[PDB]
Amino acid sequence: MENFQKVEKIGEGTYGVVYKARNKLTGEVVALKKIRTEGVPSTAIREISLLKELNHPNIVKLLDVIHTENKLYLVFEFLHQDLKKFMDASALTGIPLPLIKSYLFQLLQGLAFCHSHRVLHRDLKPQNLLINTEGAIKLADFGLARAFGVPVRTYTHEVVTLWYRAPEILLGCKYYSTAVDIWSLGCIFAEMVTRRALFPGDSEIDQLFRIFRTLGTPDEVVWPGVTSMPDYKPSFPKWARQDFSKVVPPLDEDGRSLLSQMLHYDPNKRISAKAALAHPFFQDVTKPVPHLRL
Numbered sequence: 623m624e625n626f627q628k629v630e631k632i633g634e635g636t637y638g639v640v641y642k643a644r645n646k647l648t649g650e651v652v653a654l655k656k657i658r659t660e661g662v663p664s665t666a667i668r669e670i671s672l673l674k675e676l677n678h679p680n681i682v683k684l685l686d687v688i689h690t691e692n693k694l695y696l697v698f699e700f701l702h703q704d705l706k707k708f709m710d711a712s713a714l715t716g717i718p719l720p721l722i723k724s725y726l727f728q729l730l731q732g733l734a735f736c737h738s739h740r741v742l743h744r745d746l747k748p749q750n751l752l753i754n755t756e757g758a759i760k761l762a763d764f765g766l767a768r769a770f771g772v773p774v775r776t777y778t779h780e781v782v783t784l785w786y787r788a789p790e791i792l793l794g795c796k797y798y799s800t801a802v803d804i805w806s807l808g809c810i811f812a813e814m815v816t817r818r819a820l821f822p823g824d825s826e827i828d829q830l831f832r833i834f835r836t837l838g839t840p841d842e843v844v845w846p847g848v849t850s851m852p853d854y855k856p857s858f859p860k861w862a863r864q865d866f867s868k869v870v871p872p873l874d875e876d877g878r879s880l881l882s883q884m885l886h887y888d889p890n891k892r893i894s895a896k897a898a899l900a901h902p903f904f905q906d907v908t909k910p911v912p913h914l915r916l
């Protein structure tokens with residue numbers, strides 16, 4: 623924008639490019655997302671503008687939504703690092719368990735809030751999770767994919783990651799439930815613990831089959847109505863569920879049982895964020911400070 627001094631290209635989200643910018647009128651530095659266009663739908667703008675009221679300590683504040691010159695700008699509070707970069711930076715040593723637990727806990731808190739307000743994220747991923755030096759982690763781009771419908775690619779024609787996509791989305795479910803975010807967070811929790819993505823699919827079917835290979839091909843027994851889903855094919859290979867202790871070693875039993883609940887196939891059996899906050903895994907949760915290299 624004309625009111626800002628680009629500092630760096632924070633990155634390039636699925637919807638446009640993101641810039642670290644200083645408000646040459648307030649001096650505060652923000653993350654400025656520029657969105658892609660014959661007029662632009664006002665249905666999507668009111669939905670996003672509603673996100674400005676969704677304020678919580680574990681949600682990146684959406685400062686402004688500006689629609690001008692066929693461009694949509696989203697002004698976000700700036701955090702110094704995303705979880706994907708922090709995980710890469712901790713690749714050799716791994717993120718300490720107390721910090722992983724604190725991060726999971728805070729994210730469930732952020733989700734409990736969004737979901738209690740009927741707002742779903744729909745595209746949770748490490749790059750969407752921002753952390754600060756004080757030990758806080760925050761959800762960002764909350765409710766964005768809603769009024770926009772996830773595009774096959776991004777602005778730079780890169781590639782949308784499906785690694786954190788819930789099985790019902792992959793099977794063509796028309797309606798998303800808050801359960802999709804719990805699934806994504808479960809995948810992230812496992813990745814923080816093991817230092818490797820849980821389901822690194824590079825296509826929709828590869829994603830699906832990677833899920834099936836590990837948790838077993840779902841059927842009417844574990845997931846009623848699954849065989850009636852849009853993209854469900856009776857021809858799907860039938861993989862036996864893998865022993866779970868193999869999925870996230872060496873995570874303890876409490877962590878493992880919570881993760882299994884976050885990864886139940888049936889969205890109805892999948893644990894809610896609120897219930898998860900009461901899980902015994904969080905009996906000794908604390909708030910460690912990360913060692914950040916800014």
Ligand SMILES: CC(C)(C)[C@@H]1CCc2[nH]nc(C(=O)NN)c2C1
Pocket residue numbers: 632633635640653655682698699700701702703704749750752762763
């Ligand atoms: C749209 C994406 C890219 C997910 C974030 C929006 C808000 C934000 N705040 N700090 C950051 C940040 O990347 N700090 N370095 C971001 C980025």
